[PDB]
Subunit: 65 residues, 8 copies
Amino acid sequence: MEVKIGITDSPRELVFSSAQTPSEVEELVSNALRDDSGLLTLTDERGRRFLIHTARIAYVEIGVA
Amino acid sequence: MEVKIGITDSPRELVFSSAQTPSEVEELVSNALRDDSGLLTLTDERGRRFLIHTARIAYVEIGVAD
Amino acid sequence: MEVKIGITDSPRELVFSSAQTPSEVEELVSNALRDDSGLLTLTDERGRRFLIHTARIAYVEIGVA
Amino acid sequence: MEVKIGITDSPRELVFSSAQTPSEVEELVSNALRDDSGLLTLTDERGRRFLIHTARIAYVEIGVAD
Amino acid sequence: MEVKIGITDSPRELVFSSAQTPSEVEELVSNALRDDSGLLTLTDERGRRFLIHTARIAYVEIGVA
Amino acid sequence: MEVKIGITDSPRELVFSSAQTPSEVEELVSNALRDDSGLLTLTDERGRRFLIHTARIAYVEIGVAD
Amino acid sequence: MEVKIGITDSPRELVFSSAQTPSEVEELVSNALRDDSGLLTLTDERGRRFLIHTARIAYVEIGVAD
Amino acid sequence: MEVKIGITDSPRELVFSSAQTPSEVEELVSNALRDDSGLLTLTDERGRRFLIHTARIAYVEIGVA
């Protein structure tokens, strides 16, 4: 499924395909936002790593399974 | 109904169709804004999940039912 | 009457037609700004709801009746 | 007279014609800025109301009397 | 003389002709900046009034007499 | 592997090829972000040095190994 | 010599020719930045005055003498 | 070697050629960032002076020797 992450004051919108479930990704993101984590880590189906600065996240759209 | 969410310092305006009522969406949004929640969660009619950073919300437009 | 709301750091300028009076809208807006409400709610003549983050308001321009 | 109000981080520059005197408008603006008031209110010659968030004001240009 | 005022996060650069001396204008501006005044007032040769929010000033260029 | 670093309020997105492993780079970045370090330092396969102001980091994309 | 001053969140880059020495200009700038002065004042070879809000300075480039 | 300095909320990316070593430049920059100096000073091979407001630095990219 597609994951789109908008980053405040940054022109690119991160987009990738996740091998995880909508719930797994939602948990990871929610926890980061709820806890002001300061780093959110997501991996895509090919093993690319996105390390995002939680505070700079505008939104995450998790696509349909 | 359409839900449009403007996000401060972000080009994209989030748009989707909700299976919920204007009241349900209004409650979710209002609560987030009123309580400075760290996270607002909205789901659309197809089951796409929008996790929005409440503080970055400019506005929400909730369209008319249908 | 037209209501235009400018939102800081957001391209779009919210515009709608109000079934309310200039005074009603002015009170709702003024109260939000004066009290730093954190949410302002306006409804248009068709029943669209605008939930605006008060702090992000640049201006409101309430048209003539 | 023309009143132009520049708003920080907002593309539109508010412009209108005032039925009031340069001094009246200057007092209303000065007071808002000096007191960090939450809200500045100006009306134009046609009765349009501008409610501006004082803190978001960059400048006001007040035109010459008449 | 020309007075140019740059305003941070605002596209227009205020420009006008002053009937005052470079020193008078410099005094008014310097005082505003030094004291964090919260309002700077300048008038031009035709009597236009510029009320600027001191904190939003990037620079003032005062032209030659 | 490619490393892309997005910098908040800066038009350029830093891109380079790393001689290090995804894990090495991830540790260096994670540490910087988790500790709010004042400075993150990365070197590329040609020996170019990137000194990034941690607080200004939007994201790092680490490419797949090789 | 040329002095270029970049101002954060402002399109224009201030440019002028100084009758002073690179050292004089460097001292004035350094002092302002080091001390978080509210105001930096520079004058050019024709007597134009630049009053800059120190906190809004991105950089100063001081050119070579002549 | 080339030194490129990205400045936050400023279009221009400072570029110059250094007569110093990658290590010298790295120390000067690292020290500024680590200590929140409030002024970083770099000089180029022709004697141009860059006085940069440390807090406004996005990145420095020190080229190969």
